Design a protein around this ligand. Structure first.
Ligand SMILES: [Zn+2]
Ligand SMILES: [Zn+2]
Lengths: 213, 213
């Protein structure tokens, strides 16, 4: 019947030069304007002739993971989802420390925020090749750091992601060249949006509680 | 006893601007001068305190693969070997078609050079994330196209690599941005050193011939 426009390219929740000098306008132009755009476009092309665009992007990822023997649309669907989650994981004037429930959970499960911080930055740095590092909440220790290769994300294992850093080379060449550790550091000191991470934790907690009831 | 310098960063067998305009001086400066350099430096740091530098790069790669559960030196040792193999896979004024025994083996195992060409370029483009695509000889069809992720190469499986293309994003951002397919096209059309590939196939056959004794 009436066609859809498929999945959309959501812009980052801030102007493309808002993350300077930590993430440049050229990076967002290239990372969002080309790579993220291309994942969405390529996904829309792959699902032409099907009703998959009726589903949420989440649902497409879950459906094409196929317990690890991934189906053709997975990489583009996962990358589309991962990149939207990425832009919303950061903000102008990010960095600093979390507060409230999120801080308490981090310190219950990692001892302290500083310990969590070093373990997250170190996982981000040691994930070889292309991929992502996540903080994630699991209901069924509630907080875990996750390393995934390429397009994979923890939704595929029923974890609720809370934070991610893109460590595909395209994510930091223009600002840090090959110095990923610097990239990872600036990310935690200047860009991470702890308010967004807390919002996502409150939602993961609600979903878990509500599953019981 | 007396110490070694560890593994050396061998320069590409041509001036750093000799691949222009297909692969820029900037690309070589970044890809050889930083990424390849960093692999060798990080490998040498990892094997301080051991006698692995008495071994060939090949031997370290095989030793650290551990039937898939790779040991700590693998990524740097495999990348170091891969990048050396890469720079010598190409040449100023490369491209064109292979001749002699190599062309005839390709046409036997792929039906034609154009078919081999299409399957190779298609494999290189469909290898998601970071990795490599290879033409390889197996003694046990004698030629095979192989996709590997991240640092893996076909030595690990007792194949003799004959040709490779680096499809890590750092291999082609500076010349093709995200346009990997165009990079692959220019590679097979302008850079591949079929003469070198033929030389490698000679040795591979000799190694298999001598293996009969
Ligand atoms: Zn990305
Ligand atoms: Zn490389």
């Amino acid at each position: 019947g009436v066609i859809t426009a498929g999945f959309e390219l959501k812009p980052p929740p801030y102007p493309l030069d808002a993350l300077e000098p930590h993430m440049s306008r050229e990076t967002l132009d290239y990372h969002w304007g080309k790579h993220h755009k291309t994942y969405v476009e390529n996904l829309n092309k792959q699902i032409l002739g099907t009703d998959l665009d009726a589903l949420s992007l989440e649902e497409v990822v879950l459906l094409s993971y196929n317990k690890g023997n991934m189906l053709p649309a997975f990489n583009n669907a996962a990358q589309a989802w991962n990149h939207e989650f990425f832009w919303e994981s950061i903000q102008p004037g990010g960095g600093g420390k979390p507060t409230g429930e999120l801080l308490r959970l981090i310190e219950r499960d990692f001892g302290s925020f500083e310990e969590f911080l070093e373990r997250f930055k170190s996982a981000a740095a040691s994930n070889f090749g292309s991929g992502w590092t996540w903080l994630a909440y699991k209901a069924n220790k509630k907080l875990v750091i996750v390393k995934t290769p390429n397009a994979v994300n923890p939704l595929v294992w029923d974890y609720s992601p809370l934070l991610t850093i893109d460590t595909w080379e395209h994510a930091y060449y223009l600002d840090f060249e090959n110095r990923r550790a610097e990239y990872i550091n600036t990310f935690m000191e200047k860009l991470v949006s702890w308010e967004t991470v807390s919002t996502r934790l409150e939602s993961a907690i609600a979903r878990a509680v509500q599953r019981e009831q």
